[model samples]
Target: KNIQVVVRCRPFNLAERKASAHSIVECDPVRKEVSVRTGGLKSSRKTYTFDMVFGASTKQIDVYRSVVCPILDEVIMGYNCTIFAYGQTGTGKTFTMEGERSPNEEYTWEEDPLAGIIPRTLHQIFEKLTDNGTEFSVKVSLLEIYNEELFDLLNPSSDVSERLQMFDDPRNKRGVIIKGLEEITVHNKDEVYQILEKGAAKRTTAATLMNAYSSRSHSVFSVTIHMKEVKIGKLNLVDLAGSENIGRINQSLLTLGRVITALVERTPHVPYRESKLTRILQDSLGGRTRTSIIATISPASLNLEETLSTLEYAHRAKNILNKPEVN
Candidate 1:
């Protein structure tokens, strides 16, 4: 049983650089730790350890290879894996997962070197299975959670205002059923890029409806692989909403820290102990999903306090043990 937690500090932006902002964060890969400068009148540093640590200079590909690659290999073997990027607003949580349009814009999103985990993962999936000579099918779904409501990103049939809800199965062992969500199937990696592009457009449309909607919304893009055998593999790639001031929305966000604290301490009672993940990952029954948390942080001193809070919240997640299985 295990969960991987990693911290990555963002590179300073142009304004920070123009303002002569120095990096207040340092990453030590050898030790798998992040060191942040903390000082008011005195100079001091605080260091925290994680399963992995990426510096401000770390590239997107490096992150995919280091964090997502190994777990993906297991997914192909019929394991369930979930990866969520946790951080403050504008700290590149979504960027680290969904990627962005390349500045050149001429290169297709499929070939864009800047593509993040989802695109790259989709590409690599075909790259591996296409050569394996095994018959397989891929189903993908994108869903957004906002203000305690669920919205489907790939719902092609609905133009009217629609919302989806989850139900627990009491009749059979099937644990959860999201009633109105759509699942798009992909025959090839290139074909999937168009699906992503469409979903990305829909995501932006949500932003248009509400001002700063993204700052408090969460998106989970999932890929399920049915292999030549009875093996089934799934990946829940989550680009979470900002973690800044999460107290206001403690209704839902309360599960993570609370669970981790109770779980690690081996306490008797835990608050919100059963997070939606337990429902979303039906087979997770007790413990069955391999999980990872990427704690993204801004390297600028101005965000030091927020960065520290994010790091502390993520740091305690280290002890979470997930008993992943292939069944």
Candidate 2:
């Protein structure tokens, strides 16, 4: 149960690959005419602009390499590892895990099963393990927490009505609890890509009569990296659902707020079993796994409230303790 927390900040309108090994802050340029927005405080004095400041910045990648990657590398060397993303919705948590380009020059939101961080990391693990094409293998499992319930991303045909359940693994020293599910193995990034595509196609995205690409639920993508120790021990990667402020969304904010509230609170009444996305992440967030939190931020003053709230969540998460073995 090894866990660590790292923070980073990045500027807007750019994806600086300079710091590929650490946590980061993601920011973007804003038009000079745009009004400054703050977290609930509606005072002109509290609002500011980027030009008045220096530039938009993000520390995501730096924290990734320095804090997450090195320790993850340590796990790859032999320790078990589980890393995850956490933050407010629409704050680029998915963009960070999956990669995003500056607004619109040629943005490709296509689901690349094997191209994102979680998938790419696995590919690198395999490449590092069997450099000479020696016989080696790895298995993966994908899960999602949507609408406060757990769902198997791979097998959509299964009965969605199945209740979300949890139990302890006696073999696990940390007493991790796992929801009922199946695990799949892939040979390359392409296969992982296919898995991602399938999951996205079937995921519960809603289209209000007006707009198309709308996400109605929060999601948690879990990629359990099981290595044969050709070089590294087994590891896990957890991509969690970003927290949301229902009042801001276009849909029914109250229902969504209820969902978010239940997830954050860890109570029997929380009803994680009520949503597919929550159930799948049951073990990764609350279960036994070597985990780390990668919280993303937008540096624009308009994003100050969301960014600070994100920090507060990360602060609360610090109390979660996982004792993964370090070989």
Candidate 3:
């Protein structure tokens, strides 16, 4: 049996710094907000809202480490599990999942390295396993749903250029191909972080007029934990593609818009097959994987339309029923 868990990293604000010269911007859950002070820079002080959590803001991370992380930890023990993120584009989805760039080598890119959920959860699991002197193994696989088409990052050579095919594994009673692609097996923190770095590099990204940093494709990071005398299965970590607005892209957003509509409206022809991102997540969103969805939202009232659309998609995902037993 597999257990599915959904964990959320609530959002907050931070000011830019000069020499990583930034302060640890703190939030006052009692006040329900905080101010971000940047280094020696005027006009950088800003107050952002923290209406991202359902309960008290401070308890958000607690829910993750205490609740969600423990669930995956148990999966490492026996049950198969998966954890993934879903939300519209630019809703701080990545931030909530990956956390700000850390001083650590994990995310040496723009901003701080304390990202949202995935990386943090992975770290917690590693720490627990290491402390117990448990000898275990973890394997990884990456895939994307771009334009409703599927692409296997582990082995693109196996498939033609941009050609997405579903793998048929009688074991899964489905076509889930375990192509002989590279699966980074990790036994230590450094090894895990190293694989994350490499995986991040291979991830597909693009820049467009609408978003200064837009995710052109969806990303799914899967971790399979193997240990002696454990019954838990694997943990599938998924970060989906941002749902784009056709008007903002100033380009061929019509097609992207169609995918969003199909997913949101639940139309019969809502082409999940149209983009690689959609096809890969098809099972998790509406297939074999039992899932937990954390819907990231921005509080700005002006972005109401996108926010509503995102909520609608999340709602449909709530109704998605998975056929768990194998044929």
Evaluate residue 171 in candidate 2 and report its C-alpha lDDT on the 0 to 100 scale: 71
Per-residue alpha-carbon lDDT of model 3 for 1-327, expressed as tens digits?
222322232343332222233232334444534343332323354443432233215233554654467556556656545455655566565766566565637643332245456656666667777787877776766665454444555542343124345655566542255444456666665666666665454443322212333365555677677776673466666665665443223122334345545545577875554444444445544455555666554433334455455554544444445443221
Which candidate ranks first by lDDT, i.e. highest?
1
Better of 1 and 2 by lDDT: 1
Q: Which is better, 1 or 3, measured by lDDT? A: 1
Which structure is stronger by lDDT: 2 or 3? Answer: 3
Q: Which whole-number lDDT from 0 to 100 does residue 313 have in model 1?
A: 80
**Candidate 1 TM-score, true structure as reference:** 0.91
- On residues 1-327, what C-alpha lDDT tens digit does candidate 2 reach at each position? 323554334444333223232222333334311123342334332221222111234333433444446655665556555556655555555655655444535533333322345544665666665684445566665555444444565654564335355554577433335566656677776676687667656553322221322233444444444444424455555554444543224222233234344445654564444434433334444454566666655545555556666655554554555555443
lDDT of 1 at 17: 75
Score every model by TM-score: 0.91, 0.60, 0.63
Candidate with best TM-score: 1
RMSD per model, one decimal: 2.6, 9.2, 8.8
Please give the lDDT score at residue 41 for candidate 3. 29
> Taking the tens digit of each residue's C-alpha lDDT, what string does model 1 give over 256-298?
5566677678787654325553346434323578888899998
Give the Cα error of residue 190 in candidate 3, in Å. Answer: 0.5
